[PDB]
């Protein structure tokens, strides 16, 4: 082993507990804040 | 390329086996 002592491990000062820790798949698009695709389709039908 | 990869893996296997044998023989002789 060649433990890289020169580079320190990130400090655990705060070390806040996991918010949700859900383990499904993450994925980027989940971050998006959409507007209720149902409402989107209703608006699309209304505006034709 | 696939054939060469197979050859390389076989060579590594042989090296590991030879090193195991030599280390075991040295341990037993010691």
């Amino acid at each position: 082993d060649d433990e890289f002592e020169e580079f320190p491990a990130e400090d655990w000062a705060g070390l806040d507990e996991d918010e949700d820790a859900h383990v499904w798949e993450d994925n980027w698009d989940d971050d998006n804040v959409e507007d209720d695709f149902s409402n989107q389709l209703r608006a699309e039908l209304e505006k034709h | 390329y696939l054939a060469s990869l197979i050859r390389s893996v076989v060579a590594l296997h042989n090296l590991i086996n030879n090193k195991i044998a030599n280390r075991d023989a040295e341990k037993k002789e010691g």
Partner: protein, 52 residues
Amino acid sequence: DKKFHGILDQGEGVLIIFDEPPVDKTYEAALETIQNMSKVVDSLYNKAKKLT
């Protein structure tokens, strides 16, 4: 449903019909062999612990 090999070109009102060898059956075998030899290398990694 893959009844016939062809594609529709809307706007131009066309239907293109072609013949395709979609797969090689050699590249697929090579990929499967690569996966199997990755497993073999994993086993070699496990076996090399005895060297240490």
